[PDB]
C-alpha cells in the first residue's frame, strides 16, 4: 500500500477485530441462561399519585433533588420551576434567558440549579441568594454546539455534554473548562455520572456510548451495538453497569468489566424510539420512556416487558427515580410531570 | 410547622399568579422558526426584520404585527447534523423555509431537506412557509442563459408553465417558467404526503422586500384558521 492512511485503516480494522475477539472470549454465557431460574416480577401497576401542573410548554428535563422531595423541571417556555413533590407546591419559578432549555440539574447540596440548551451556555442559579431574588450566578461558555445534558459533581464542578461532540468538566467558580473529553463523532445526547462521581458515560448519535474518566480527561471505554442514535443513559446503581436507550426501539445493558452488551430489551410491537432510561433503587426494574406516550417497566434481568405507565397523552421526554427509590417522576411534552409509585 | 405550611401556600400563591401572567404572555406570542440551507439569506431576513420592523447574527427577533407578537429565531451556532435539535421545534407556529432558488446545485440539497422536514415524525403538524428567495438573481441567470435548469432537472424541458400563474408586470416568460417550476418542485413534495394536518405556502421573496412581515402574518393566521377548521371537522 505505502499510503499511511491505508496502513492505518488496515491496522484499525485489525485492532477492531482483536477487540471483537477479546470481547467474545469473555462472553461465555448469556444473561438469559443465568437468569432463567428467577421468578418474573409479574405485573407492576403504579398509579399517578401526584400531577404537577403549571408549565406552559413541553417539559424537556427533570431532576430529583438529593432529599428525594424537591425536583427541578425545565420547560421550553423558558422556565425552570422547582417543586416540593410531597405537597405539589412551587418553591421557585426561575425565568430563563434563552427559552430553549434542554437539560436541567439539581446540585447534590441543593444550593444551585443548572440549565442550558441551544444557547450553548450552562447557567448556574443560586437558590440560596440572600437579599433579593434567585438570579443567575455563573454562566459557563465555550461550546460550539447545543448543550444537551449536565449534572453536578459538587458545588464547584459540573459536567456538560454538547452537540459539538464533546463533554466537558467545568469549575463553576472560575468558569474554565478544567477538563475536556473528545472522541465522539456525533452529537452527545445524554450523560450519567457514576454513583461515586469518579466516571461518567455519554451516548452519542454515532450509535456509540463512551465511558470517560472524569479526573484524567481520557476516554476509557467505547461501547457499540446499537443500530442508531442513543438518546438516554443511566448507570446501574452498583456502578459497574449502565443502560442505554436508542431510536432503534431497544434498550441495552452494558457491563464495564465484561466490556460488551449483556441484554436487549425489545418487543416486536415496539417500533418507536426511546427517550429516557432509569433503574430503580435496587436495579431490578428498568423504566424506559418510549415515544408512543407510555413508559414501559422492564425486568432488567429477564428482558421481559412487565408493566406500563400509560398516563401521558404525548411523548415522555424525561423521567427520574428518587434517590431513596420511593417514586418515579415522568415529564412529557404535554407539560405535566407526574409522580408514580 | 403550620407556619411553614402557610409559607409554602403563600409562596405558591405568589408563584401561581406570576405564572398566570407568564402564561398569558407566552400564550399570545407566536413563535416562528427560520430554517433553510445557508447561503440562502435566513440571517439576512432576521437582520432585515430587526432594522425595518424591530427586534431585540443573533438568533432571535421579536416583532409585532397588528398587536400580535411574533418571535422569529434562526439557529446559527450549530453543526450541520440538524437531526436532533430539530425536535426542539415541535410547537412552533410555522417553519419559514428559505431557499436560494438561484443556486442550481445546492438546490437538490434544499429539496431533500424540505422532504425530510415534511416527513419528520415530530414535525408532521408544523406547517411550513416556503420562501423562494433571491428572485432577482434568478432572473439574472435566466436572462443570461448561461446556466439552464434543464442540465440539473431534465424534467424542466417538458415542463409547462401553469395556467394559474400570476407574473408581476414586466417579467420574461422564461423567468416565470423557471420560478414556477421551482415552486412546483417543492409543492409536489409538500402535497405528496397529504393528511391535512399541515400545508406548505410558497412565496417568492427577495432580500429587499419590506412586506415580508405582512406575509408571515397572513400565513400564520391562515395556519391557525386551518387548524381550527380541521379541529371541528369542517375542512
Amino acid at each position, epitope marked *: 500500500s505505502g499510503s499511511e492512511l491505508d496502513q492505518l*485503516r488496515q491496522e484499525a480494522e485489525q485492532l*477492531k477485530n482483536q477487540i471483537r475477539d477479546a470481547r467474545k472470549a469473555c462472553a461465555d454465557a448469556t444473561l438469559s441462561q443465568i437468569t432463567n431460574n428467577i421468578d418474573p416480577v409479574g405485573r407492576i401497576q403504579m398509579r399517578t399519585r401526584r400531577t404537577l401542573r403549571g408549565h406552559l410548554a413541553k417539559i424537556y428535563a427533570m431532576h430529583w433533588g438529593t432529599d428525594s422531595r424537591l425536583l427541578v423541571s425545565a420547560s421550553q417556555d423558558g422556565k425552570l420551576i422547582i417543586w416540593d413533590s410531597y405537597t405539589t407546591n412551587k418553591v421557585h419559578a426561575i425565568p430563563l434567558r434563552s427559552s430553549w432549555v434542554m437539560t436541567c440539574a439539581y446540585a447534590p447540596s441543593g444550593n444551585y440549579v443548572a440549565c442550558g440548551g441551544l444557547d450553548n451556555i450552562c447557567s448556574i442559579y443560586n437558590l440560596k441568594t440572600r437579599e433579593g431574588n434567585v438570579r443567575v450566578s455563573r454562566e459557563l461558555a465555550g461550546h460550539t454546539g447545543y448543550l444537551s445534558c449536565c449534572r453536578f459533581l459538587d458545588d464547584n464542578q459540573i459536567v456538560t455534554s454538547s452537540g459539538d*461532540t464533546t463533554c466537558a468538566l467545568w469549575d463553576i467558580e472560575t468558569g474554565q473548562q478544567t477538563t475536556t473529553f473528545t472522541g465522539h*463523532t*456525533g452529537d452527545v445526547m445524554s450523560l450519567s455520572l457514576a454513583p461515586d462521581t469518579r466516571l461518567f458515560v455519554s451516548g452519542a*448519535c*454515532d*450509535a*456509540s456510548a463512551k465511558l470517560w474518566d472524569v479526573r484524567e480527561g481520557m476516554c476509557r471505554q467505547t461501547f*457499540t*451495538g446499537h*443500530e*442508531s*442514535d442513543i438518546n438516554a443513559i443511566c448507570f446501574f446503581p452498583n456502578g459497574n453497569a449502565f443502560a442505554t436507550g436508542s*431510536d*432503534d*426501539a431497544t434498550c441495552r445493558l452494558f457491563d464495564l468489566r465484561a466490556d460488551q452488551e449483556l441484554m436487549t430489551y425489545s418487543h416486536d410491537n415496539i*417500533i418507536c*424510539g426511546i427517550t429516557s432510561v432509569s433503574f430503580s433503587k435496587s436495579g431490578r426494574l428498568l423504566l424506559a420512556g418510549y415515544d408512543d406516550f407510555n413508559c414501559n417497566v422492564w425486568d432488567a434481568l429477564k428482558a421481559d416487558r412487565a408493566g406500563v405507565l400509560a398516563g401521558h397523552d404525548n411523548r415522555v421526554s424525561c423521567l427520574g427515580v428518587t434517590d431513596d427509590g420511593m417514586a418515579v417522576a415522568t415529564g412529557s411534552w404535554d407539560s405535566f410531570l407526574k409522580i408514580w409509585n | 410547622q403550620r407556619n411553614e405550611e402557610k409559607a409554602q401556600r403563600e409562596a405558591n400563591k405568589k408563584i401561581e399568579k406570576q405564572l398566570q401572567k407568564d402564561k398569558q404572555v407566552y400564550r399570545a406570542t407566536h413563535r416562528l422558526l427560520l430554517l433553510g440551507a445557508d447561503n440562502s439569506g435566513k440571517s439576512t431576513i432576521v437582520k432585515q426584520m430587526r432594522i425595518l420592523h424591530g427586534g431585540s447574527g443573533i438568533f432571535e427577533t421579536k416583532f409585532q404585527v397588528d398587536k400580535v407578537n411574533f418571535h422569529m429565531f434562526d439557529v446559527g451556532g450549530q*453543526r*450541520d*447534523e*440538524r*437531526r436532533k435539535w430539530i425536535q426542539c421545534f415541535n410547537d412552533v407556529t410555522a417553519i419559514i423555509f428559505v431557499v436560494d432558488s438561484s443556486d442550481y*446545485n445546492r438546490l*437538490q*440539497e434544499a429539496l*431533500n*431537506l424540505f*422532504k*425530510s*422536514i*415534511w*416527513n*419528520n*415524525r415530530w414535525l408532521r403538524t408544523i406547517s411550513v412557509i416556503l420562501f423562494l428567495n433571491k428572485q432577482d438573481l434568478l432572473a439574472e441567470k435566466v436572462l443570461a442563459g448561461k446556466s439552464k435548469i434543464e*442540465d*440539473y*432537472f*431534465p*424534467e424542466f424541458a417538458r415542463y409547462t408553465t401553469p395556467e394559474d400563474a400570476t407574473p408581476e408586470p414586466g417579467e420574461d416568460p422564461r423567468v416565470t417558467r423557471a420560478k414556477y417550476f421551482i415552486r412546483d418542485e417543492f409543492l409536489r413534495i409538500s402535497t405528496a404526503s397529504g393528511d391535512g394536518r399541515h400545508y406548505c405556502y410558497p412565496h417568492f421573496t427577495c432580500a429587499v422586500d419590506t412586506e415580508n412581515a405582512r406575509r408571515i402574518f397572513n400565513d400564520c393566521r391562515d395556519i391557525i384558521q386551518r387548524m381550527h377548521l380541521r379541529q371541528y371537522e369542517l375542512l
Partner: nanobody, 128 residues
Framework: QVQLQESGGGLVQPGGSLRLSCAAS????????MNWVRQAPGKGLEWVSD????????SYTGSVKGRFTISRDNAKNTLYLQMNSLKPEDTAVYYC?????????????????????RGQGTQVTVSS
C-alpha cells in the same frame, strides 16, 4: 458496530459502466431507507439517489436520471448502484449512506463532515 463496506469502482472510460456493491453489517438492512451519496473532488457532499425500505419507491437526482440504477437485495443484505454511460463529471468517491432511523421516510445524511452510518468510498475515476 454499524459498518458499511462498498466495493467495485476503478478507472473507466467515458460512456463505460460499473457496479458498486454496498454490503451492510451491524443492523437489520430491511428497516432503513438507503441512499447513494457521491462526492466529487473539490466540492461538498452531493446526494445521488435513494431507495426505500424494500425497493418500493425509488428516486434519483436529475443529473443521473436515465443513467444509473439502484437495486436493494435484503436476502444478501446489500444494495448495488449499477452505473452506465458515465460522463467525465461523474468522477467522485461514492459513499453508500444509510439514514439513521428505521420505519420512516426522512433522513438528514449528506452532512458536511461526519455522519456515522455511511461507508468510506471507492474513488471512481472517469476520463479520456
Amino acid at each position: 458496530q454499524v459498518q458499511l463496506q462498498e466495493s467495485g469502482g476503478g478507472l473507466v472510460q467515458p460512456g463505460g459502466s460499473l457496479r458498486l456493491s454496498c454490503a451492510a453489517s451491524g443492523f437489520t438492512f430491511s428497516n432503513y431507507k438507503m441512499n447513494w451519496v457521491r462526492q466529487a473532488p473539490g466540492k461538498g457532499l452531493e446526494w445521488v439517489s435513494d431507495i426505500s425500505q424494500s425497493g418500493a419507491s425509488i428516486s434519483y437526482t436529475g443529473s443521473v436520471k436515465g443513467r444509473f440504477t439502484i437495486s436493494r437485495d435484503n436476502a444478501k443484505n446489500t444494495l448495488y448502484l449499477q452505473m452506465n454511460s458515465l460522463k467525465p463529471e461523474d468522477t467522485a468517491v461514492y459513499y453508500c449512506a444509510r439514514c439513521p432511523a428505521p420505519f420512516t421516510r426522512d433522513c438528514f445524511d449528506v452532512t458536511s463532515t461526519t455522519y456515522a452510518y455511511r461507508g468510506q468510498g471507492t474513488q471512481v475515476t472517469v476520463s479520456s
